């Protein structure tokens, strides 16, 4: 019974929108590229590999020239765009 306003009950559909937007953004971004930023992997997989690499170096943050920041920014930008569009499509149309 989440009210989005004073008297406006609205279903946020956070599980569906989150899961569907995550899958619909991650799966197309599994397309590989041979550029050094990706390293032979897709955008999502290069991002996850960079997460593992930098978590193997805790305290020490990723450097400026490290591909982690660019991978994180592009991946989260596309994810946020997918989440916004998925929220619009599922909450509005619902069919």
């Amino acid at each position: 019974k989440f009210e989005v306003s004073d008297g406006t009950p609205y279903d946020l559909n956070v599980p569906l929108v989150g899961a569907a937007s995550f899958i619909g953004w991650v799966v197309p971004t599994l397309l590989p590229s041979q550029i050094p930023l990706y390293g032979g992997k897709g955008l999502s997989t290069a991002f996850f590999a960079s997460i593992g690499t930098n978590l193997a170096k805790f305290p020490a943050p990723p450097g400026m020239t490290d591909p982690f920041w660019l991978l994180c920014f592009i991946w989260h930008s596309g994810l946020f765009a997918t989440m916004i569009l998925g929220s619009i499509g599922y909450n509005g149309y619902a069919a």
């Binding site: 019974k1 989440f2 009210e3 989005v4 306003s5 004073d6 008297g7 406006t8 609205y10 805790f58 305290p59 020490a60 509005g92």
Partner: protein
């Protein structure tokens, strides 16, 4: 499906009911804050608010003050926080002196006795929170370096 409605179902009041202003999350957070939470004396509202604000007041004075590169940086930062707390308590006192008439009602913040109780609670909470932050930063090297001790 409209998300913005007139405030309190009154279209001529100077406010709008918005998701930032009137959602369930906003209403729960605002009604659960110590300044608005039901069942609290004004003194205990003051205690909670003072604990929070006085606790976080130590940090900027300790890390950025003129004595920040000295061995007495934390002591100076706590003393600066205490001086700011005393100044703000004087501000609270003069606000309550000029703002409220002497009434029997004392269970509300916006009464003279209620504001005096709130000021007393805010002073005691602010001193306690600042002292707690002083104790924790004095005894934990992680807080002294803001995490750089791990490197």
């Amino acid at each position: 499906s409209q998300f913005i409605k007139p405030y309190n179902d009154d279209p001529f009041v100077g406010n709008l009911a918005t998701p930032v202003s009137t959602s369930s999350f906003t209403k729960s957070l605002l009604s659960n804050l110590p300044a608005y939470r039901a069942g609290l004396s004004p003194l205990l509202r003051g205690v909670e608010i003072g604990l929070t604000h006085g606790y976080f007041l130590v940090g900027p004075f300790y890390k950025l003050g003129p004595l920040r590169n000295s061995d007495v940086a934390l002591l100076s930062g706590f003393f600066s926080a205490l001086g700011l707390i005393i100044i703000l308590v004087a501000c609270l006192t003069i606000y309550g002196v000029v703002s409220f008439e002497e009434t029997e009602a004392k269970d509300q913040l916006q009464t003279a006795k209620g504001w005096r109780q709130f000021t007393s609670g805010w002073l005691v909470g602010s001193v306690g929170g600042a002292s707690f932050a002083y104790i924790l930063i004095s005894n934990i090297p992680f807080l002294q370096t803001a995490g750089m001790s791990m490197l």
